[PDB]
Design a protein around this nucleic acid. Structure first.
Length: 324
DNA sequence: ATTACCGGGCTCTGCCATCTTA
DNA sequence: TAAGATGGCAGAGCCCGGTAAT
């Protein structure tokens, strides 16, 4: 009876919560009060708590014992309570979507057995907390898939390919094997692509391509190809460009296009752009801002070394002063 | 003294469909 | 036989600066 009343004083968005997990509002007993006190005990603010419950109401059905034990387990990896509060504020999901603290502990044990340092586990938990609410079996499937993928390519020891991939791509363990697989084949088919260069790309600059949802990478590449084609770039140039800078794939089509256009409207050549791909790191606002200042000075941009467009504020602002 | 090369940091959460489970 | 547990989807960059090269 008191549920809807307490949720209110807690400042919970009751309507949003009702829509997310209706079943929680039909339970006879709930522990919203204990949860609030528990989360307060560990630094969480009243607003954070309200936000947490609004998003994952089932949170209020956990007991003081489970909560405390789960938290303790996380503290085997994360060095402070505050670090755990921030993770839960980001997404309540990993912490609250399971009450199975045995599975959690097995996940921790299994990851250690994979050869991962506690520092790495901390990295995994902080970046991809949801790794730890996966079933052990799900985490096993991915690790196996990765070993199998490692040796199916030219890797001297798969067990170490796994750890490299996990370090560069903390999110790898919260992707389906279907998704990752599709992204590897995309890369393999689309480009060259010998195993040795595939490995490097995968454990390096192109690591997060493997986390890309279905058809997103193929579609992004096809737009890049078209856009660059219409601009007089050959296929080999496009390939070279994307491989020298796979981050470009993460941009939305319109953003990529808009960014190319905003540069070339100031008469920077497409050749200048793709030979200095990092200029594509700066936002359209930042590029426009700097382009104004540069042309606002003696600069012609057509013959200027445009690398500065993507330099840190400090280094850019310095070069700009000198330029006057 | 200045630019090139290059890696690292942030936050990547929140929804829904399908099973398990009691 | 409804909730809880679980898997898996779609989501759509920008910035800084240490160190090597010049």
């Amino acid at each position: 009876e008191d549920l809807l009343k307490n949720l209110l004083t807690m400042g919970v968005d009751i309507d949003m919560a009702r829509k997310r997990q209706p079943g929680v509002f039909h339970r006879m007993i709930t522990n919203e009060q204990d949860l609030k006190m528990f989360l307060l005990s560990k630094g969480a603010s009243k607003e954070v708590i309200a936000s947490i419950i609004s998003r994952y109401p089932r949170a209020i059905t956990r007991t003081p014992e489970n909560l405390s034990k789960r938290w303790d387990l996380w503290r085997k990896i994360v060095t402070s309570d505050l670090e755990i509060v921030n993770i839960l504020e980001r997404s309540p999901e990993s912490f609250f979507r399971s009450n199975n603290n045995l599975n959690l502990e097995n996940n921790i044990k299994f990851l250690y057995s994979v050869g991962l340092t506690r520092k790495c586990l901390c990295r995994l938990l902080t970046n991809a907390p949801r790794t730890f609410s996966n079933s052990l079996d799900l985490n096993k499937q991915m690790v196996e898939f990765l070993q199998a993928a490692g040796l199916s390519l030219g890797h001297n020891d798969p067990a170490d390919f796994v750890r490299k991939i996990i370090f560069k791509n903390p999110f790898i363990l919260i992707q389906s094997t279907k998704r990752v697989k599709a992204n590897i084949e995309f890369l393999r088919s689309t480009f060259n692509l010998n195993s040795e260069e595939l490995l490097v790309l995968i454990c390096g600059p192109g690591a997060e391509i493997l986390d890309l949802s279905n058809d997103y990478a193929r579609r992004s590449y096809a737009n890049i190809k078209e856009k660059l084609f219409s601009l007089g770039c050959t296929e080999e140039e496009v390939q070279k460009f994307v491989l020298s800078y796979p981050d470009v794939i993460f941009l939305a089509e319109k953003k990529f296009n808009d960014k190319i256009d905003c540069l070339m409207e100031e008469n920077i050549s497409i050749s200048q752009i793709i030979e200095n791909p990092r200029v594509l790191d700066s936002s359209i606002s930042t590029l426009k801002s700097r382009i104004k200042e540069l042309v606002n000075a003696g600069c012609n941009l057509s013959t200027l070394n445009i690398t500065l467009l993507s330099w840190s504020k400090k280094r850019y602002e310095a070069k700009l002063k000198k330029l006057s």
